[PDB]
Design an enzyme around this catalytic site. Structure first.
Site, PDB file in Angstrom:
ATOM      1  N   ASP A  35       0.838  -1.195   0.000  1.00 43.68           N
ATOM      2  CA  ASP A  35       0.000   0.000   0.000  1.00 43.68           C
ATOM      3  C   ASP A  35       0.878   1.251   0.000  1.00 43.68           C
ATOM      4  O   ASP A  35       1.359   1.669   1.061  1.00 43.68           O
ATOM      5  CB  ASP A  35      -0.890  -0.008   1.232  1.00 43.68           C
ATOM      6  CG  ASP A  35      -1.823   1.191   1.305  1.00 43.68           C
ATOM      7  OD1 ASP A  35      -1.930   1.912   0.299  1.00 43.68           O
ATOM      8  OD2 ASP A  35      -2.434   1.385   2.388  1.00 43.68           O
ATOM      9  N   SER A 199      -0.622  15.707 -11.902  1.00 50.01           N
ATOM     10  CA  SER A 199      -0.861  15.368 -13.289  1.00 50.01           C
ATOM     11  C   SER A 199      -1.118  16.630 -14.105  1.00 50.01           C
ATOM     12  O   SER A 199      -1.658  17.622 -13.603  1.00 50.01           O
ATOM     13  CB  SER A 199      -2.065  14.425 -13.367  1.00 50.01           C
ATOM     14  OG  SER A 199      -2.462  14.187 -14.696  1.00 50.01           O
TER      15      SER A 199
END
Length: 330
Positions: A35, A199
């Protein structure tokens, strides 16, 4: 040193991925959910409340000659899905894909919430976010990657998740045969303890690319792609009959649909998520309403590049003094 381990989807939907991990002496192999959105290595154990164990493999520290109680240390964690676990702490030898850390904090669960009990395939979690998020008190502990870093050939790990197929976590090296083209690296903020990046925009299907900054986290422990409501609405508007359902808890679409791809920007590069990766199947067995793999982050507080996005790429988690993330197509 290096390590290399195969990671395998737990079910036909890629709801999560499990990777075998050796703990203790002699080795006890548990299948852990790696994770990158958390920083605790915790396991089902001989200390876990018996009624909360249903098929998981447990770590028994009393059977490990290298286990030592970390006296006074406790841990307690809550995840973004509302699940939780807590317990005490041992140090022991932990190996992943041939890479060994001695003295790793292994957090033994005394209690786990129902969603963990109900998933017999996940024996615990191995956190790979920054150690500043580790929940051990009163002495915070380091992640497996942080402990291994100094010994690694290069201070990196890579995630290469498969679509409906196994993939690979590598530690200490970048497998140049595992991706196509070049790797585009992008800056990371560690201020929230995550692999947080920005992004450069998105496209839906064959549509034009929209340049816009989207701050989010690279999170292997989250199944889906969670993005701003504007972006998610633009995606689902291209699917006839798709709608957001408050009763179901997100966007659903007709199972008869063919889904468009979704592209996200990494600097000037582009990662394309095929439409099929966005199908999470019937909302309930036999339903013709299917659950979408792109959902709004509006209720979370952060955008999450989860498995739906990451499995479309070869992803480098660069843990150099200034961390960065790299993405390549594959």
């Amino acid at each position: 040193s290096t390590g290399s381990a195969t990671t395998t989807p737990i079910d036909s939907l890629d709801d999560a991925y499990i990777t075998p991990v050796q703990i203790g002496t002699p080795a006890q192999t548990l299948n852990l959910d790696f994770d990158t959105g958390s920083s605790d290595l915790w396991v089902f154990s001989s200390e876990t409340t018996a009624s909360e164990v249903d098929g998981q493999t447990i770590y028994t520290p009393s059977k490990s000659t290298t286990a030592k109680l970390l006296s006074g240390a406790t841990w307690s964690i809550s995840y973004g899905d509302g699940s939780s676990s807590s317990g005490d702490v041992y140090t022991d030898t932990v190996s992943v894909g041939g890479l060994t850390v001695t003295g790793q904090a292994v957090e033994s669960a005394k209690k786990v919430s129902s969603s963990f009990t109900e998933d017999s395939t996940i024996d615990g979690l191995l956190g790979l976010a920054f150690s500043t998020l580790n929940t051990v008190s009163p002495t915070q502990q380091k992640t497996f990657f942080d402990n291994a870093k100094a010994s690694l050939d290069s201070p990196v790990f890579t995630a290469d998740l498969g679509y409906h197929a196994p993939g690979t976590y590598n530690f200490g090296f970048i497998d140049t045969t595992a991706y196509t083209g070049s790797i585009t690296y992008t800056a990371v903020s560690t201020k929230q303890g995550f692999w947080e990046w920005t992004s450069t925009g998105y496209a839906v299907g064959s549509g034009t690319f929209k340049s816009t900054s989207i701050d989010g986290i690279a999170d292997t422990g989250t199944t889906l792609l969670y993005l701003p409501a504007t972006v998610v609405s633009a995606y689902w508007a291209q699917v006839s009959g798709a709608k957001s359902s408050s009763s179901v808890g997100g966007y659903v679409f007709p199972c008869s649909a063919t889904l468009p791809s979704f592209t996200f920007g990494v600097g000037s590069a582009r990662i394309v998520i095929p439409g099929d990766y966005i199908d999470f199947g019937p909302i309930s067995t036999g339903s013709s309403s299917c659950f979408g793999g792109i959902q709004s982050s509006a209720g979370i507080g952060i955008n999450i590049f989860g498995d739906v996005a990451l499995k479309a790429a070869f992803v480098v988690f660069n843990g150099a003094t200034t961390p960065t993330l790299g993405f390549a197509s594959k």
